[PDB]
Amino acid sequence: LDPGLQPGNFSADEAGAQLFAQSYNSSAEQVLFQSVAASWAHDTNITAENARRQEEAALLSQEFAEAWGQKAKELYEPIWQNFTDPQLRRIIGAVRTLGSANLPLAKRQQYNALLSNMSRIYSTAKVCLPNKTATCWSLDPDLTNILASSRSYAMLLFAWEGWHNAAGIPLKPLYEDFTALSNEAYKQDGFTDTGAYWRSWYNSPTFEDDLEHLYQQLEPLYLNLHAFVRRALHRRYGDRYINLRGPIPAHLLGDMWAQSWENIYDMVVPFPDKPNLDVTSTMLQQGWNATHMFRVAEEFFTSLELSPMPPEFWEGSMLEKPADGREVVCHASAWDFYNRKDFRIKQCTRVTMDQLSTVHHEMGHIQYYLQYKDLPVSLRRGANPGFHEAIGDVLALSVSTPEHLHKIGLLDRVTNDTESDINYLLKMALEKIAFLPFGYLVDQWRWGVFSGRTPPSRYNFDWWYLRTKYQGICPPVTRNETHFDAGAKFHVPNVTPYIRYFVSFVLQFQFHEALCKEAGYEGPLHQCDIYRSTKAGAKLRKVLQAGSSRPWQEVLKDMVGLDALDAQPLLKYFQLVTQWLQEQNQQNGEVLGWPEYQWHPPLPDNYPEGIDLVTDEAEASKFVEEYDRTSQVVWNEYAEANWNYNTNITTETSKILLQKNMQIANHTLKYGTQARKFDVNQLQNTTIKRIIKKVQDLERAALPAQELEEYNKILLDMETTYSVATVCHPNGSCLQLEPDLTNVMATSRKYEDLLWAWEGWRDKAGRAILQFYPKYVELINQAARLNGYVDAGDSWRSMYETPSLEQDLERLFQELQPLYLNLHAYVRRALHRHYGAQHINLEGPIPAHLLGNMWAQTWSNIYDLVVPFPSAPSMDTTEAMLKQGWTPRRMFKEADDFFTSLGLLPVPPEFWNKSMLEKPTDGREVVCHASAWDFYNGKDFRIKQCTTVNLEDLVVAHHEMGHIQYFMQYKDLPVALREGANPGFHEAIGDVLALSVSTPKHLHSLNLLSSEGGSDEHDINFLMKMALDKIAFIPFSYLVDQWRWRVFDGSITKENYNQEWWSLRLKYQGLCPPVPRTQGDFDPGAKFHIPSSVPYIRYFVSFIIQFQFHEALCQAAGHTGPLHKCDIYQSKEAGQRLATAMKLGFSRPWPEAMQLITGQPNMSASAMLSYFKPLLDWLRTENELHGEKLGWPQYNWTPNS
Ligand SMILES: *[C@@H]1O[C@H](CO[C@@H]2O[C@@H](C)[C@@H](O)[C@@H](O)[C@@H]2O)[C@@H](O[C@@H]2O[C@H](CO)[C@@H](O[C@@H]3O[C@H](CO[C@H]4O[C@H](CO)[C@@H](O)[C@H](O)[C@@H]4O)[C@@H](O)[C@H](O[C@H]4O[C@H](CO)[C@@H](O)[C@H](O)[C@@H]4O)[C@@H]3O)[C@H](O)[C@H]2NC(C)=O)[C@H](O)[C@H]1NC(C)=O
Ligand SMILES: *[C@@H]1O[C@H](CO)[C@@H](O[C@@H]2O[C@H](CO)[C@@H](O[C@@H]3O[C@H](CO[C@H]4O[C@H](CO)[C@@H](O)[C@H](O)[C@@H]4O)[C@@H](O)[C@H](O[C@H]4O[C@H](CO)[C@@H](O)[C@H](O)[C@@H]4O)[C@@H]3O)[C@H](O)[C@H]2NC(C)=O)[C@H](O)[C@H]1NC(C)=O
Ligand SMILES: *[C@@H]1O[C@H](CO)[C@@H](O[C@@H]2O[C@H](CO)[C@@H](O[C@@H]3O[C@H](CO[C@H]4O[C@H](CO)[C@@H](O)[C@H](O)[C@@H]4O)[C@@H](O)[C@H](O)[C@@H]3O)[C@H](O)[C@H]2NC(C)=O)[C@H](O)[C@H]1NC(C)=O
Ligand SMILES: *[C@@H]1O[C@H](CO)[C@@H](O[C@@H]2O[C@H](CO)[C@@H](O[C@@H]3O[C@H](CO)[C@@H](O)[C@H](O)[C@@H]3O)[C@H](O)[C@H]2NC(C)=O)[C@H](O)[C@H]1NC(C)=O
Ligand SMILES: *[C@@H]1O[C@H](CO)[C@@H](O[C@@H]2O[C@H](CO)[C@@H](O[C@@H]3O[C@H](CO)[C@@H](O)[C@H](O)[C@@H]3O)[C@H](O)[C@H]2NC(C)=O)[C@H](O)[C@H]1NC(C)=O
Ligand SMILES: *[C@@H]1O[C@H](CO)[C@@H](O[C@@H]2O[C@H](CO)[C@@H](O[C@@H]3O[C@H](CO)[C@@H](O)[C@H](O)[C@@H]3O)[C@H](O)[C@H]2NC(C)=O)[C@H](O)[C@H]1NC(C)=O
Ligand SMILES: *[C@@H]1O[C@H](CO)[C@@H](O[C@@H]2O[C@H](CO)[C@@H](O[C@@H]3O[C@H](CO)[C@@H](O)[C@H](O)[C@@H]3O)[C@H](O)[C@H]2NC(C)=O)[C@H](O)[C@H]1NC(C)=O
Ligand SMILES: *[C@@H]1O[C@H](CO)[C@@H](O[C@@H]2O[C@H](CO)[C@@H](O)[C@H](O)[C@H]2NC(C)=O)[C@H](O)[C@H]1NC(C)=O
Ligand SMILES: *[C@@H]1O[C@H](CO)[C@@H](O[C@@H]2O[C@H](CO)[C@@H](O)[C@H](O)[C@H]2NC(C)=O)[C@H](O)[C@H]1NC(C)=O
Ligand SMILES: *[C@@H]1O[C@H](CO)[C@@H](O)[C@H](O)[C@H]1NC(C)=O
Ligand SMILES: *[C@@H]1O[C@H](CO)[C@@H](O)[C@H](O)[C@H]1NC(C)=O
Ligand SMILES: *[C@@H]1O[C@H](CO)[C@@H](O)[C@H](O)[C@H]1NC(C)=O
Ligand SMILES: *[C@@H]1O[C@H](CO)[C@@H](O)[C@H](O)[C@H]1NC(C)=O
Ligand SMILES: [Cl-]
Ligand SMILES: [Zn+2]
């Protein structure tokens, strides 16, 4: 056994300890030299061959430490603390620390290999997508780069969790075993636990207490910065993920561990316009090279009259990426061979301003070694383990200053711009101030572990609690005791303390302030440099010269003047950013800190399936531009043919239209598929947000081509079936739905013929639709689900943008029941005297085939049988219009006048030349359903009506003009939003401007009626005529879409379609079928919009909200008294009240426009009840005159045969 490796015999005396120590020093540096030599070789020449040597030399070192430690611990430990000279005690104490070696060999292997496994797992940790990806991501570059570079919350979250999953989960069991052995080993050394040993290095009886006091003094700076970043992150990600008062999601801070916020500087940079001064471009033109960069650095130290580099340095240092091309650990490091004769830097230098500063840092280490190289090896270390880095840093700060750069010559003028330095200082603030709490809590956490304050069942609980309490962060996902996120940070599984850095950071600024004060410098500390200040160099040298001989605190007191750490120097360095940030925080009213800490974000909508979705908003903006630009042409093209065909039925126009139909199909699918690639939930431009959400709906196109084909096939089969069904008399005479059968329903008073027509249409048209409905439902439900809805019912109901729709609709309907019930009963009485009790039960629901309409959706056809007062007309308005020479254009002209008096946009000139106001006489065939058309060209707007000169068409004209008016004033929005606030609004506006038309006042104002006796009966007569549609149509319109909703809900099946229909027909319309019906019939097929699969609830909304608007206009127009006597005419303000609302188009939720119009954000039936209040009174009264009893409790009655 080499005497140079094993201690000899020594007494327990100080002289013996001195002789032992002296002997230890001589051999120790020899051993260390061998160890580092191979270390340098492998690190400088990466190969398994050198790895083997490194492994061997390190092994030898341990045996040496074991031999000497063994003797030292045995010899002096009973007396060592009494040795007079602390110098000796320091040396002996270090060697006397055996650590792991204390463990028995079996535990040694377990402990040593265990540590190796912990290290292996961390570096081996791989994160893989939930796909059989060809290659996964490792911690770096992939995971760190993607996490540092990506800004997609979903993507960023997945990477953050995966790393914690792979790294944390497997470490949790192992780390416990380390805890037992680690504490067990140090127990033999004499420390209560691993934590006590690490804290022992700082020789501070109140060390941990000191740090909390330090941290509390820095918290004011940290909170201000935390609030500022919190605000900035909120600007980027939105309140959904950033609670202005709560903690910040750990994964959004730009780095896997949130230990450094540098990567978010691009979002927060003050004065973004001032460029960061980079001297690299000049450095290159200066011909500088890495080798000279270091000699430049050496000159700085010579300016400090410190020791220049030994020639050994120029020879040994691995300044560059070696020309030999052999592999090397390019990460810049400074190496000190304990051989007093040499020290080396390994830079792998590349010419950048950053590396220039880096080199100065590393050289500072070299300078530090040189100054204490004279001390014994045991003392040739920092005053405290954090002390080392600080010295290197303070040197790094001074040179980074542009003042210093100018002194070097790399800058022509030192522009003293506060915006520049604030931008710079803020970058440094994000780089390291954000680090302070993190570095503190990790070792705060570990002491809890080693002390047992955090038992195993709390590894993760205390981790997040501590991480949240100090750093102000919460997890991106709820995490529980199964996890061990502590294993996610390199320093944990590698069991390397973190506290050194935090203390080092405070010492850095603490030293810096001292030298600046020593250098006679004044003013801004961040503008200080120590260059050329020999007096300060001597002070710095003093601190280095002592090395680890003198206790760090003693040296610090001599340097700066204070026996302990303090935050004051650090704050003064950042004073400027401190002041500035508070104002930025003050102006935003930020809540310093994070109350309501128990808050955290929701998971992404499709996590983890949506983690690769594109969230960049700049391209989405351009996307919307191209979409509008292209969609305008396609819809206009579509509209052109669609208009051309609707007026010119010529068969070839249909062929043309079909081809155009394919184009919109092409376009819809093309841009729809592209739209689905944008992730809307992360966007913040509200306009773009709604636009993309809409376009993302692919409707039928979400179905597979085969099923889409099958779906369209079925639609046409149903559409065709309805299109060709007819009812035929026994003689074979066949009647069509319109106008033929409609006239029967409208004109017949014969119970037999009405039933035959109603029954017949339902028998041939109705029953047949069951040939397709079931699969039809299944298919559209499949499509709805593929579009992200629960079912087709959810899909349609979603267009009202309000989840409580059905509840609101329900309440709205209930509020009309008193009126509807009175009307219902009154009509029943009218039917009673014409069809008799044998067919009319005055105490039950009404036979659904007598309401004058094939579907009983509108009762206006029976007005003659229900009129409350005859002698209603003072003049025939039809003959009067004829007498006054009224023409279709004159009719629409009067409407434009009304609209002009209301200050709304006049109709464009081309309208008068391309609209079709009359039945063509050139043999063209027209689709006569009156409607209004928008060509999306900001100039083409047209009306198509088979205009007849009568009052009815006069209402149609205004109604159509209403739509036109609505198109014109939102023409400025992009096509994607050229829609009403909601489906109802568009159809609702149509009535509002028309309502006044039929009032007696407006009727008379145009002399359509000569003066009439001012009877209320004429008002009542008009109001009932209105109610006979406005009211009756409400419940029917409600029932259809509810019936479909519950069918889309799957809650209703074919076995009872008929029963659910009639049950609803009873509950909502108070109706029953005229004759019993069994399965095989499917009455709902009897109404077009069902087999045509078109929603109806819009009409209901239209007939409600239109009355709120009318009241608002009458209120704004100043009208008082009976609401039906209101006349909007020429109200310059009332028009403007609507104008501002219409311009919103579909860009806003309808509650905004609703309020902007009426002053309320909710739909309210009260306006309508008020409108009909007089008629209700009369009808209610009439019920008393006849003693009519309201309701239909006696469900089962039908007309007698
Ligand atoms: C890294 O940089 C080193 C520093 O180079 C200096 O700084 C850079 C930014 C340039 O400005 C460069 O021109 C500077 O020299 C660099 O070392 C330098 O390498 C250059 C060539 O690349 C050498 O140039 C020659 O210099 C001599 C004069 O220098 C000697 O004498 C003076 C005293 O007079 C001493 O102070 C010096 O230390 C040297 O001992 C010139 O006489 C010689 O002239 C030749 O070229 C001219 C035409 O230009 C002809 O007319 C002559 O007849 C000769 O043919 C060169 O100009 C320079 O000596 C050297 N300086 C030092 C201090 O070593 C180093 O090579 C770089 N390393 C890498 C890896 O890039
Ligand atoms: C920890 O252990 C190491 C190794 O034992 C000690 O390192 C020795 O340190 C001493 C100085 O403390 C060094 O002595 C120097 O020797 C130089 C001559 O070296 C040649 O000659 C010797 C034999 O005399 C050979 O062994 C050697 O290989 C060379 O061939 C001198 O030139 C030096 O001069 C300096 O010191 C003298 C006073 O001694 C002054 O008068 C001079 O002006 C000058 O300042 C010096 O004498 C010795 O070389 C080191 N050994 C090794 C192997 O490097 C550490 O000292 C010890 N730690 C402590 C705290 O003692
Ligand atoms: C309803 O829509 C229909 C389809 O758009 C219109 O039908 C067109 O009616 C015109 C007459 O009104 C017919 O004119 C004939 O066209 C053929 C072929 O013309 C083509 O070739 C010549 C060169 O030889 C070219 O100059 C033309 O532009 C055409 O490209 C001639 O041979 C005849 O002499 C006559 O001019 C069209 O044929 C006919 N087209 C179609 C597709 O049916 C109809 O006019 C519309 N009705 C209204 C009232 O607008
Ligand atoms: C330090 O001093 C101790 C004594 O205080 C030395 O220990 C002795 O080491 C020798 C061998 O180097 C041992 O010799 C053997 O002794 C036994 C009887 O004890 C004898 O039968 C054998 O034939 C052999 O000679 C001796 O046992 C051992 N003594 C004790 C008490 O362990 C040690 O060598 C000294 N080391 C140095 C570096 O000075
Ligand atoms: C980097 O590391 C590798 C491996 O540690 C070194 O490779 C070894 O280099 C030596 C010479 O430097 C080789 O030995 C010599 O090879 C020549 C040519 O065959 C022969 O003429 C000599 O007599 C002697 O055998 C050795 O084979 C080679 N490989 C190994 C495994 O040792 C490499 O030199 C290192 N480079 C640096 C810059 O440190
Ligand atoms: C560090 O991790 C390695 C790898 O997990 C551990 O090595 C493994 O150690 C176990 C026993 O400690 C060996 O178990 C044997 O496995 C074979 C199947 O491979 C089985 O047939 C035997 O009955 C037995 O269970 C295992 O072979 C061995 N693997 C290797 C590659 O050597 C090591 O023990 C871990 N050390 C610590 C301290 O956690
Ligand atoms: C702690 O919380 C974690 C989640 O944060 C819990 O682990 C999770 O447990 C569920 C099932 O309980 C796992 O999901 C299931 O996976 C199976 C396939 O293994 C699948 O068939 C199921 O449909 C379901 O998706 C989930 O993957 C798992 N996640 C993790 C990260 O382990 C754990 O149970 C909680 N433990 C305690 C004590 O609170
Ligand atoms: C949201 O994005 C839309 C779409 O680009 C922006 O609309 C632009 O508005 C300016 C005037 O404000 C017009 O000059 C542009 O023509 C509009 N864009 C297009 C494509 O026409 C809108 O300003 C954005 N709003 C917010 C709050 O981000
Ligand atoms: C088939 O028979 C019915 C029943 O006789 C005919 O319907 C009548 O048509 C006339 C006008 O053509 C009406 O005035 C009657 O009121 C209808 N009666 C009924 C009960 O509806 C029908 O016209 C006959 N068709 C043919 C082609 O002979
Ligand atoms: C010296 O030893 C005595 C007796 O064990 C003890 O009371 C005293 O505290 C020791 N001195 C030091 C500095 O530990
Ligand atoms: C920059 O200007 C400020 C003005 O308040 C001054 O305090 C500071 O000393 C100036 N710095 C330099 C380097 O001129
Ligand atoms: C449009 O649809 C037709 C259908 O056959 C197809 O042939 C054509 O390639 C499509 N074009 C685009 C751009 O989608
Ligand atoms: C309408 O057409 C006539 C020709 O029939 C033309 O004189 C007039 O200028 C056209 N007006 C507009 C607005 O196009
Ligand atoms: Cl709808
Ligand atoms: Zn360093």
Distances (CA, A) of 90 to 70, 440, 622: 17, 27, 69
955, 941, 867, 947: which is closest to 909 by C-alpha? 941
Question: Are the C-beta atoms of residues 229 and 454 closer than 8 Å to each other?
Answer: no
DSSP 632-645: HHHHHHHHHHHHHH
**Could you give the 3-state DSSP secondary structure of residue 1174?**
helix
Q: By CB neighbour count within 10 A (0-12 exposed, 13-18 middle, 19+ buried), where does 376 fall?
A: buried
Amino acid at 482: T
d(C-alpha 185, C-alpha 705), whole Å: 70
Q: CA torsion sign, 835 to 838 to 844 to 847? A: negative
Question: Are the C-beta atoms of residues 230 and 590 closer than 8 Å to each other?
Answer: yes
Distances (CA, A) of 144 to 136, 147, 187, 421: 13, 5, 39, 29
Q: Count of alpha carbons within 13 Å of 607, Cβ hemisphere only?
A: 18
* The two three-digit tokens of residue 1200, written as one number: 């007698």
Q: How many helices (H) and strands (E) does the chain have?
A: 47, 12
364, 362, 356, 363: which is closest to 411 by C-alpha? 356
540, 548, 265, 677: which is closest to 430 by C-alpha? 265
Amino acid at 753: D
Which technique was the structure solved with, according to the deposited record?
cryo-EM
d(C-alpha 789, C-alpha 795), whole Å: 6
Strand partners, 727: 735
**Could you give the 3-state DSSP secondary structure of residue 513?**
helix
> C-alpha angle 785/788/792, rounded to 5°?
50
Element (H, E) at 623: helix 617-647
Distances (CA, A) of 653 to 423, 639, 675, 723, 925: 66, 12, 32, 20, 12
SS3 content of the chain, % helix, strand, coil (to 5): 60, 5, 35
* The two three-digit tokens of residue 1134, written as one number: 């009332």
Q: CA torsion sign, 259 to 260 to 261 to 263? A: negative
Question: Are the C-beta atoms of residues 698 and 669 closer than 8 Å to each other?
Answer: yes
**Could you give the 3-state DSSP secondary structure of residue 1072?**
strand
274, 529, 216, 237: which is closest to 426 by C-alpha? 274
> Residue ranges of the alpha helices (H) in 48-152?
48-76, 86-96, 105-124, 144-149
938 Cα to the center of ligand 13, angstroms: 18
Q: Is the peptide bond before 608 cis (omega within 30 degrees of 0)?
A: yes
Q: Judge if the beta carbon of residue 113 lies within 6 A of ligand 6.
A: yes
**Could you give the 3-state DSSP secondary structure of residue 1081?**
strand
**Alpha-carbon dihedral of residues 615, 621, 626, 628, nearest 10 degrees?**
110
Strand pairing report for 941-944 and 734-735: unpaired
Distances (CA, A) of 151 to 76, 157, 852: 59, 10, 64
**Could you give the 3-state DSSP secondary structure of residue 480?**
coil
Element (H, E) at 729: none
d(C-alpha 518, C-alpha 536), whole Å: 5
d(C-alpha 1075, C-alpha 847), whole Å: 9
**Could you give the 3-state DSSP secondary structure of residue 839?**
coil
d(C-alpha 1137, C-alpha 1140), whole Å: 6
Element (H, E) at 658: helix 651-675
DSSP designation for 249: E
Q: Judge if the beta carbon of residue 29 lies within 6 A of ligand 2.
A: yes
How many Cβ atoms are within 10 Å of 638's Cβ, its own excluded?
19
The whole-angstrom distance between residue 1128's C-alpha and the CA centroid of its chain comes to 45
d(C-alpha 968, C-alpha 934), whole Å: 9
Question: Are the C-beta atoms of residues 1171 and 1107 closer than 8 Å to each other?
Answer: yes
d(C-alpha 239, C-alpha 243), whole Å: 6
Q: Judge if the beta carbon of residue 910 lies within 6 A of ligand 13.
A: yes
Distances (CA, A) of 755 to 150, 847, 852, 863, 1201: 70, 10, 11, 20, 12
d(C-alpha 437, C-alpha 594), whole Å: 15
738, 766, 721, 1088: which is closest to 927 by C-alpha? 738
916 Cα to the center of ligand 13, angstroms: 14
Where residue 903 falls (left for φ over 0; alpha for ψ -120 to 50; beta otherwise) is: left
Q: Judge if the beta carbon of residue 373 lies within 6 A of ligand 2.
A: no
How many Cβ atoms are within 10 Å of 599's Cβ, its own excluded?
12
The whole-angstrom distance between residue 444's C-alpha and the CA centroid of its chain comes to 34
Distances (CA, A) of 398 to 39, 282, 353, 435, 519: 32, 20, 14, 21, 12
How many Cβ atoms are within 10 Å of 184's Cβ, its own excluded?
16
- Catalytic positions: 362, 491, 960, 1089
Q: Judge if the beta carbon of residue 9 lies within 6 A of ligand 4.
A: yes
Q: CA torsion sign, 315 to 320 to 324 to 326? A: positive
Distances (CA, A) of 1032 to 747, 815, 855, 1029, 1068: 19, 14, 11, 5, 11
Within 6 A (CB) of ligand 5 lie 45, 47, 49-50, 324, 326
Distances (CA, A) of 740 to 148, 746, 767, 864, 1085: 73, 10, 20, 20, 19
* The two three-digit tokens of residue 748, written as one number: 């017949």
Distances (CA, A) of 636 to 87, 631, 648, 694: 93, 8, 17, 19
d(C-alpha 859, C-alpha 854), whole Å: 10
Strand partners, 942: 933
- Biggest CA–CA distance in the chain, Å, is 138
d(C-alpha 461, C-alpha 453), whole Å: 12
Instruction: Answer yes or no: is 729 a known binding residue.
Output: no
**Could you give the 3-state DSSP secondary structure of residue 942?**
strand
- Give the closest residue (by CA) to ligand 7 atom 7: 482
* Atom number of ligand 2 nearest to Cα 30: 4
* Atom number of ligand 4 nearest to Cα 3: 38
Question: Are the C-beta atoms of residues 792 and 783 closer than 8 Å to each other?
Answer: yes
Strand partners, 1071: 846
d(C-alpha 26, C-alpha 31), whole Å: 9
Strand pairing report for 1071-1072 and 846-847: parallel
Q: CA torsion sign, 75 to 81 to 82 to 84? A: positive
- Cα first-last separation, the chain: 125
d(C-alpha 302, C-alpha 296), whole Å: 10
How many Cβ atoms are within 10 Å of 50's Cβ, its own excluded?
17
DSSP 338-404: SSTT--EEE------HHHHHHHHHHHHHHHHHHHHTTS-GGG-S-SSTTHHHHHHHHHHHHHHSHHH
Q: Which residues does 1129 contact at the CB level (< 8 Å), separation at least 6?
A: 898, 901, 902, 996, 1002, 1005
Strand partners, 842: none
Which ligand has the shortest distance to the CA of 407? Answer: 11
Could you give phi then psi for residue 692, rounded to 5 degrees? -65, -40
Q: Where are the domains of the chain?
A: 1-97, 278-384, 617-696, 884-989
Q: Count of alpha carbons within 13 Å of 478, Cβ hemisphere only?
A: 4
Q: Which of 617, 685, 972 to mutate to test the pocket of ligand 8 (most atoms within 8 A of CB)?
A: 685
d(C-alpha 709, C-alpha 605), whole Å: 31
d(C-alpha 725, C-alpha 29), whole Å: 106
Q: Which residues does 541 contact at the CB level (< 8 Å), separation at least 6?
A: 304, 305, 306, 371
d(C-alpha 330, C-alpha 582), whole Å: 41
